[PDB]
Ligand binder design. Structure first.
Ligand SMILES: CCCCCCCCCCCCCCCCCC(=O)OC[C@H](CO[C@@H]1O[C@H](CO[C@H]2O[C@H](CO)[C@H](O)[C@H](O)[C@H]2O)[C@H](O)[C@H](O)[C@H]1O)OC(=O)CCCCCCCCCCCCCCCCC
Ligand code: CLA
Ligand code: CLA
Ligand code: CLA
Ligand SMILES: C=Cc1c(C)c2cc3nc(c4c5[nH]c(cc6nc(cc1[nH]2)C(C)=C6CC)c(C)c5C(=O)[C@@H]4C(=O)OC)[C@@H](CCC(=O)OC/C=C(\C)CCC[C@H](C)CCC[C@H](C)CCCC(C)C)[C@@H]3C
Ligand SMILES: CCCCCCCCCCCCCCCCCC(=O)OC[C@H](CO[C@@H]1O[C@H](CO)[C@H](O)[C@H](O)[C@H]1O)OC(=O)CCCCCCCCCCCCCCCCC
Ligand SMILES: CCCCCCCCCCCCCCCCCC(=O)OC[C@H](CO[C@@H]1O[C@H](CO)[C@H](O)[C@H](O)[C@H]1O)OC(=O)CCCCCCCCCCCCCCCCC
Ligand SMILES: CCCCCCCCCCCCCCCC(=O)OC[C@H](CO[C@@H]1O[C@H](CS(=O)(=O)O)[C@@H](O)[C@H](O)[C@H]1O)OC(=O)CCCCCCCCCCCCCCC
Ligand SMILES: CCCCCCCCCCCCCCCC(=O)OC[C@H](COP(=O)(O)OC[C@@H](O)CO)OC(=O)CCCCCCCCCCCCCCC
Ligand SMILES: CCCCCCCCCCCCCCCC(=O)OC[C@H](COP(=O)(O)OC[C@@H](O)CO)OC(=O)CCCCCCCCCCCCCCC
Ligand SMILES: CC1=CCCC(C)(C)C1/C=C/C(C)=C/C=C/C(C)=C/C=C/C=C(C)/C=C/C=C(C)/C=C/C1=C(C)CCCC1(C)C
Ligand code: OEX
Ligand SMILES: [Cl-]
Ligand SMILES: [Cl-]
Ligand SMILES: [Fe+2]
Lengths: 33, 34, 334, 34, 36, 37, 81, 30, 65, 36, 38, 341, 32, 36, 30
């Protein structure tokens, strides 16, 4: 299908940036206790 | 016009009737407000 | 120590991370069959001739759909309410063209979902609970029976059961409105009241409890750490919440009894959704919404339109366009 | 010793007085013919 | 003071609602708004 | 000059990570069709 | 609990109903009359069954000017006199 | 590519389910 | 805490934390500018809205020429 | 296809009998308080 | 000059003013008669 | 002990209906919005704005009665009684749609007053103000739908009219013209309302079915005491139940009740945003990839294309009667129609 | 320039993924 | 029953700086070839 | 898009330089 090329990069980043943020904060939480 | 007095006469009578039935007790409350 | 009795012990064990139970024994296979067929069909099923007119509707991702437009398409109107298992088709290719997978999925799901409700009773009994959580789930379950089974039975075709997809859902509810004036049906109006009211009382209850949490924490920590799982003391002040809410309205429109309050929370959306499921279930037999078309006329007899007549003009445009190739005669009687 | 007229009295009659009047007007309406 | 038992008030009130609401449904079939 | 006394540790527990990832994944699932358009 | 008189104690009281068996019907009748006299039509501008259209008319008299709108509906109402 | 993206995200959600259930923080009493 | 040339110059601008005029102070005068400002915002709104119409005030693009 | 039909009839009968006999195996007694 | 809508404006401005002032005249009065004790 | 304080004393007295400073904005405006709607639906027509009957007086019933929006020709006029449109004539004001703006504006100022009341009572009682916060969601919906949406359009005419069936008409309009069901912000609202209703029901049922036996009677309501310290139901048994049935459960009563606030409030806020977009006709109407393929390939059909045929029907069949100021004349031969129907 | 439009996403993930890996390890180090 | 072989892992700031530089320079180098 | 990408990466390196110098692990004499 003739689909917006940037949709892919947009989706990947939309997923990746907020997810990595959350993981960073979780892992350094476990390294405390 | 005349229809307005038609319409309003029951409401006036109603308030009139209630004013007469409650007036004695309403002054006992007003006196108590100092 | 006997074999069957040890099996029975494991089936009904309160120690499995997920409870199985005897309802589980039917639920698990049927929901696995329905899930697995759904996922494969959604991704890769070929187009299905939903309306029996040799006009196949493409529903799956690999045939040019996205997450919003895709669906498992209902089986063919040519089949009607005939049972169409795989082994009744000459081949899988035929079964696919005619919409076999919808039947497989909805029958397995409705079974497994009925057993889901029963499983809720069962574990409630094994744990020494009161038993009626399952009665609350009967509202959603009745709703799924209405759009997947009851409405097809009354209209005589699974082709008129709700599609398994996002836009298919919208298609179903638009066509329903043209054919039943569901907006003007009191049972749908009670559904809306049950669902708007449900979200309202959800927000209310959550904001009232949250407003009256007792200070157990500092401003640098989540208040949630003020409650410890299994503590015996209640974690908010209900008299303070009653005192605020009864002054926001008046005293006697507010609940000081937490049992009545939580029972109210349960009954309002459950009863509203019963009625709206009953709406779909009785419009399935064409007892439709109020019809006030041309109900107001003037002294001469000119029709004086109301908002119901405007609704009718919109329903008319739905009616005349839907399934634009499937009707050969002037009335759409099912 | 209770008051008769309160803020409460006012809010009640704020609503009830025109409710009845309105109900009367709507009753009269069922007999309009075209 | 507390002379009319409350159950009597409720029955008469209740029947009074039934009456007016009934009139409104009767009017759905007669006169304006009846389709006739 | 003393080191800054307003510094605080930050926390995200495991449940909050699960909730947060579900939110983002489901958000992506919903808007991806519109991004591809 | 706040000092006003309980409701249950007012609506069972003999004094209460002495007034309200007059005031309720008077209002119900006042509202009736408001309609049966025709006054409601005139106060609100609401067409009567005979006055939505002129006799051979099938045009809605739709307002179509903002600042001349008052004059427009006045025109449509003389087209029925 | 859009098909792969859709199924990929869906696949991640199912995996998340697995960990959320079987690798949860285990609730502990008082 | 660190003293700096610029810090010593601005010092009195950040020296009266907490200081208040007693009672209501100028509150009644504030209220008058608030009331005036409302009426003036009303006028501005109703001019834009065309429920206030004024001589030689033509609320159209045709006022650029 | 007939092999598929047979297989499904068998699998279904199996699970439905597990279910029937499971509940026939003294289900009222499998609770935490009063067993019978 | 002083157009009809400008007259309407002043009409509305005084009517609001009347309403708000009357409203507050009543509340100031009631609150003086029926005070909390302390 | 000046007069401002005396009035504060009086406003804040504990009485059957609390008044407050917020009561001064709230109560007149709430009563007037409500009174306008009962007045218009009993007595006032929509003939001159809409070509519709809309009151009990005209023979409408409770479903079809409405306070209808002003004529399209009024633009976004405030339609003040004393304004240049009605020029102070009550009667003309009613016939031009003045009660719509009356209701919408007094309604908006009542909403503010009500939310200020939630703030005022919460400060006087000493609880946190999360109920006011939650109420921001209804406000967002009201302003965006009744105010922002028509302000982006040609006139108030296209806002919702205050009536049951007029609102149903508004729903259908948004489907045909905006394809609103396709809009992801609406979809998040749907999930927020439906998930709210689910949470409401599942939380109520759980409490009622993990109750502790605190009394001898079969009616379990009697055995709660609003001042007991103890939880009245078992979070522990509730949590094992739902962990075993559904895989996950709540373990934290505070989080649970915040989540109950969070879900329906957020959902409503999302829908508000989408309606702001539609104020500008900025819709999610189409998928471009679908249209390009379908234009080129007459065998390609999806539920997305089926639904736009229906939107197309809706528009052509309702537009002339629903927008009478446009004087649309669609001769029979141009109406879209499938076979036979 | 008629470049490879999968190059943008390859370059972006080439940077993001290993960099995130490093950042995660470094931060959890600084907090123990 | 916790596993005795678990170890904590470390990456110091200097290793982050070196590692980030490595990644960025590899990206700047290969990106031209990826776009081609 | 390709120009933006090369410039972005170059820009990140320059920012890395700044932190690696001014926000280094300070060497101390243990
Ligand atoms: C959350 C908390 C909420 C609490 C708020 C409580 C509610 C307070 C009540 C506020 C009432 C506001 C109503 C404003 C009416 C409106 O706008 O009235 C509209 C008028 C302009 O009028 C319209 O103007 C339009 C454009 O006209 C122009 O174009 C024509 C063709 O070119 C001609 O040239 C004409 O002369 C020229 O003026 C059309 O003519 C319309 O028919 C006419 O109604 O603006 C004006 O009054 C003023 C407009 C600018 C002021 C900003 C308004 C802010 C609100 C808008 C924000 C949303 C924006 C919408 C985008 C979506
Ligand atoms: C503001 C407008 C509005 C509102 C609030 C509603 C509200 C509602 N409508 Mg109406 N509707 C509207 C406008 C509106 N509608 C319009 C404009 C139209 C015409 C175009 C319609 C046409 C319409 C139709 C045709 C129908 C509704 C229905 C409904 C209900 C849907 C919710 C429901 O069925 O829950 C009930 C709950 C469920 C359906 C959930 C079942 C859940 C199953 C049991 C479990 C699923 C498990 C899942 C697959 C896996 C999850 C696990 C996870 C790990 C993956 C609700 C009362 C429906 C209804 O009444 O159905 C009974 C219905 O069929 N409406
Ligand atoms: C606080 C309660 C309240 C509020 C907030 C409103 C708000 C509103 N009303 Mg409502 N109204 C109220 C109470 C209220 N009303 C009451 C009690 C009644 C019954 C009488 C009405 C009856 C009513 C009608 C009939 C109408 C409104 C309308 C309006 C709107 C326009 C108001 C306007 O332009 O004011 C303009 C005026 C002011 C803002 C007053 C400003 C006061 C300044 C600060 C002081 C000036 C003092 C003066 C100049 C000094 C003395 C002068 C000299 C001669 C001595 C607005 C939404 C109109 C509407 O809805 O339009 C569709 C409309 O037609 N109201
Ligand atoms: C499953 C079905 C379903 C569901 C759950 C929803 C859910 C929703 N829809 Mg959608 N809708 C659907 C189907 C559905 N819709 C379909 C099929 C269509 C056709 C396209 C639409 C068309 C549609 C439209 C056209 C709109 C919605 C809107 C909404 C939202 C309404 C929010 C709300 O509570 O407003 C309720 C109203 C308020 C909260 C405003 C304030 C209310 C105050 C507090 C009233 C107070 C009353 C007062 C005290 C006295 C009243 C007394 C009197 C009655 C006697 C909500 C997210 C609206 C939206 O998104 O808005 C942003 C909207 O405009 N829907
Ligand atoms: C259509 C659905 C709907 C209605 C009718 C409704 C109604 C209400 N919600 C309230 C509250 C709330 N609603 C909340 C969340 C929600 N509310 C929702 C949906 C609704 N909420 C949803 C979905 C949520 C979830 C987020 C919360 C959290 C609260 C509260 O705290 C509050 C409450 O106390 O509830 C217990 C009350 C506010 C009372 C008030 O402002 O009095 C003052 C009255 C005023 C200001 C008049 C408003 C006039 C309106 C705006 C215009 C006129 C309307 C006409 C008169 C009637 C038109 C009828 C036609 C449309 C058919 C009121 C009972
Ligand atoms: C403290 C004191 C108490 C304060 C009183 C407060 C009153 C405020 C409440 C307002 C109620 C609004 C309902 C008016 C209905 C009415 O007048 O119908 C009036 C109409 C009159 O009936 C119509 O009359 C016409 C006369 O020309 C024609 O004959 C029509 O055919 C006929 O239908 O009645 C109905 O349509 C039929 C009865 C259906 C009644 C509606 C059912 C109730 C609806 C729910 C109530 C709304 C609340 C929603 C809650 C969510
Ligand atoms: C994990 C997260 C992602 C990690 C970073 C991802 C980027 C990594 C780099 C990917 C390769 C970049 C290729 C440019 C992108 C592109 O255009 O590719 C795109 C190409 C595909 O090519 C596409 O094909 C299309 C038809 O399907 C059309 O032809 C398109 O025009 C064309 O772009 O991707 C590949 O071909 C897949 C790569 C598989 C290569 C395996 C062989 C290499 C094995 C040697 C490895 C030795 C390494 C030694 C190192 C020590
Ligand atoms: C065109 C303009 C139109 C808009 C203008 C509207 C003006 C708004 C004013 C509304 C105020 C009405 C409420 C007060 C009336 C009342 O009876 O209270 C004061 C008196 C009541 O008595 C007392 O009642 C008191 C109880 S309470 O305060 O009413 O709750 C009690 O304390 C006391 O003992 C008892 O004697
Ligand atoms: C839907 C929720 C209701 C569930 C039903 C149970 C409620 C629980 C009550 C608390 C515990 C039990 C007490 C039982 C007692 C009980 O259920 O109620 C009875 C109560 C009557 O109380 P009395 O003072 O007559 O007697 C004390 C009672 O406790 C009798 O037992 O009814 C009223 O409040 C009538 C007033 C309503 C009319 C007010 C109209 C004016 C309003 C104007 C202002 C508008 C709103 C505010 C502006 C925003
Ligand atoms: C045999 C049948 C079993 C059915 C299998 C179903 C398993 C899937 C259920 C959820 C797993 C993921 C939940 C993760 C998140 C997680 O682990 O949460 C766990 C969390 C635990 O809450 P606690 O109260 O313990 O947390 C307290 C504090 O830690 C908060 O900081 O539970 C909730 O918050 C409940 C509300 C979440 C409700 C989320 C459910 C929605 C899931 C469905 C959405 C799916 C859309 C998918 C479309 C493709
Ligand atoms: C049908 C049904 C089923 C459930 C049981 C129940 C018995 C409740 C039942 C019956 C209930 C019925 C039918 C309720 C009907 C109630 C009605 C009709 C009440 C009407 C109340 C009307 C009121 C206040 C009107 C207030 C009007 C006001 C301010 C207007 C103010 C103003 C306006 C609008 C314009 C500017 C001038 C002014 C004066 C400021
Ligand atoms: O398929 Mn589905 O939709 Ca119930 O109607 Mn007849 O059919 Mn068809 O048409 Mn309309
Ligand atoms: Cl269709
Ligand atoms: Cl046919
Ligand atoms: Fe609760």
């Amino acid at each position: 299908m003739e689909v917006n090329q940037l949709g892919l990069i947009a989706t990947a980043l939309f997923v990746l940036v907020p997810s990595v943020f959350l993981i960073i904060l979780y892992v350094q939480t476990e390294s405390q206790q | 016009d005349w229809r307005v007095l038609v319409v309003l006469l029951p409401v006036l009578l109603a308030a009139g009737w209630a004013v007469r039935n409650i007036l004695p007790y309403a002054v006992k409350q007003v006196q108590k407000l100092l | 120590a006997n074999l069957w009795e040890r099996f029975c012990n494991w089936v009904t064990s309160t120690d499995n991370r997920l409870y199985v139970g005897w309802f589980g024994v039917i639920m698990i296979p049927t929901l696995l069959a329905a899930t697995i067929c759904f996922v494969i069909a959604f991704i890769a099923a070929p187009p299905v001739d939903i309306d029996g007119i040799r006009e196949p509707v493409s529903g799956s991702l690999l045939y040019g759909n996205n997450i919003i437009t895709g669906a498992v398409v209902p089986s063919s109107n040519a089949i009607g309410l005939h049972f169409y298992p795989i082994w009744e088709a000459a081949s899988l290719d035929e079964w696919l063209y005619n919409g076999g997978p919808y039947q497989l999925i909805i029958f397995h799901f409705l079974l497994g979902a009925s057993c889901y409700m029963g499983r809720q009773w069962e574990l409630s009994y094994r744990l020494g609970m009161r038993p009626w959580i399952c009665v609350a789930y009967s509202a959603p379950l009745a709703s799924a029976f209405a759009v997947f089974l009851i409405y097809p039975i009354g209209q005589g075709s699974f082709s008129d059961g709700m599609p398994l997809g996002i836009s298919g859902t919208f298609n179903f509810m638009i066509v329903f409105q043209a054919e039943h004036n569901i907006l003007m049906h009191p049972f749908h109006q009670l559904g809306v009241a049950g669902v708007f009211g449900g979200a309202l009382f959800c927000a209310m209850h959550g904001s009232l409890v949250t407003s009256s949490l007792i200070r157990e924490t500092t401003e640098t920590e989540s208040a949630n750490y003020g409650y410890k799982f299994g503590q015996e003391e209640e974690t908010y002040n209900i008299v303070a919440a009653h005192g605020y809410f009864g002054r926001l309205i008046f005293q006697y429109a507010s609940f000081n009894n937490s049992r009545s309050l939580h029972f109210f929370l349960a009954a309002w959306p459950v009863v509203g959704v019963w009625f709206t499921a009953l709406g779909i279930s009785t419009m399935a037999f064409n007892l439709n919404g109020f019809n006030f078309n041309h109900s107001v006329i003037d002294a001469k007899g000119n029709v004086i339109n109301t908002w119901a007549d405007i609704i009718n003009r919109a329903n008319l445009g739905m009616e005349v366009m839907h399934e634009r190739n499937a009707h050969n005669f002037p009335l759409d009687l099912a | 010793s209770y008051p008769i007229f309160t803020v409460r009295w006012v809010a009640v009659h704020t609503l009830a007085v025109p409710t009845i009047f309105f109900l009367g007007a709507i009753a009269a309406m069922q007999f309009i013919q075209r | 003071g507390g002379r009319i038992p409350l159950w009597i008030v409720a029955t008469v009130a209740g029947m009074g609602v039934i009456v007016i609401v009934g009139l409104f449904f009767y009017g759905a079939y007669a006169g304006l708004g009846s389709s006739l | 000059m003393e080191p800054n006394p307003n510094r605080q540790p930050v926390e995200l527990n495991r449940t909050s990570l699960y909730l947060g990832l579900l939110l983002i994944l489901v958000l992506a699932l919903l808007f991806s069709s519109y991004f591809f358009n | 609990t706040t000092g006003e008189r309980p409701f249950s104690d007012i609506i069972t009281s003999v004094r209460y109903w002495v007034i309200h068996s007059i005031t309720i019907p008077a209002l119900f009748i006042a509202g009736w009359l408001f309609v049966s006299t025709g006054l409601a039509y005139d106060v609100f501008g609401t067409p009567r069954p005979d006055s939505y259209y002129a006799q051979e008319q099938r045009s809605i008299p739709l307002v179509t000017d903002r600042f001349e709108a008052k004059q427009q509906v006045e025109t449509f109402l003389e087209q029925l006199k | 590519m859009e098909t792969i993206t859709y199924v990929f995200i869906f696949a991640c959600i199912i995996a998340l389910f697995f960990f959320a259930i079987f690798f949860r923080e285990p609730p502990r009493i008082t | 805490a660190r003293r700096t040339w610029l810090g010593d110059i601005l010092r009195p601008l950040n020296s009266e934390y907490g200081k208040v005029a007693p009672g209501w102070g100028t509150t009644p005068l504030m209220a008058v500018f608030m009331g005036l400002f409302l009426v003036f915002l009303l006028i501005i709104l109703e001019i834009y809205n065309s429920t206030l119409i004024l001589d030689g005030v033509n609320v159209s693009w045709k006022a650029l020429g | 296809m007939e092999t598929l039909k047979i297989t499904v009839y068998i699998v279904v009968t199996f699970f439905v009998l597990l279910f029937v006999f499971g509940f026939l195996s003294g289900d009222p007694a499998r609770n935490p308080k009063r067993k019978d | 000059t002083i157009t009809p809508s400008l007259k309407g404006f002043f009409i509305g401005l005084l009517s609001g003013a009347v309403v708000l002032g009357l409203t507050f005249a009543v509340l100031i009065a009631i609150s003086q008669i029926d005070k909390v004790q302390r | 002990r000046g007069w401002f304080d005396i009035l504060d004393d009086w406003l804040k007295r504990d009485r059957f209906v609390f008044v407050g400073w917020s009561g001064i904005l709230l109560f007149p405006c709430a009563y007037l919005a409500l009174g306008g709607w009962l007045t218009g639906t009993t007595f006032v027509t929509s003939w001159y704005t809409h070509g519709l009957a809309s009151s009990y007086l005209e023979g409408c019933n409770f479903l079809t009665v409405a306070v209808s929006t002003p004529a399209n020709s009024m633009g976004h006029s405030l339609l003040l009684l004393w304004g240049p449109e009605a020029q102070g004539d009550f009667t003309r004001w009613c016939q031009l749609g003045g009660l719509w703006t009356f209701i919408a504006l007094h309604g908006a100022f009542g909403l503010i007053g009500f939310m200020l009341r939630q703030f005022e009572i919460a400060r006087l009682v000493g609880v946190r103000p999360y109920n006011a916060i939650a109420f921001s969601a209804p406000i967002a919906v009201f302003v965006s739908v009744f105010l922002i949406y028509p302000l982006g359009q040609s006139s108030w005419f296209f806002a919702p009219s205050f009536g049951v069936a007029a609102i149903f008409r508004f729903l259908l309009f948004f489907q045909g013209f905006h394809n609103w069901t396709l809009n992801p912000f609406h979809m998040m609202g749907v999930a927020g309302v439906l998930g709210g209703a689910l949470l409401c029901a599942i939380h109520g049922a759980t409490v009622e079915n993990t109750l502790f036996q605190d009394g001898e009677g079969a009616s379990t309501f009697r055995a709660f005491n609003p001042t007991q310290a103890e939880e009245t139901y078992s979070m522990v048994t509730a949590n094992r139940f739902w962990s075993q049935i559904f895989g996950i459960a709540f373990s934290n009563k505070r989080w649970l009740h915040f989540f109950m606030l969070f879900v329906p409030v957020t959902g409503l806020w999302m829908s508000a945003i989408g309606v702001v977009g539609l104020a500008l006709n900025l819709r999610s109407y189409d998928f471009i990839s679908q249209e390009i393929r379908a234009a080129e390939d007459p065998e390609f059909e999806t539920f997305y294309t089926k639904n736009l045929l229906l939107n197309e029907g809706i528009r052509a069949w309702m537009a002339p009667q629903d927008q009478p100021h446009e004087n649309f004349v669609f001769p029979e031969e141009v109406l879209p129609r499938g076979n036979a129907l």
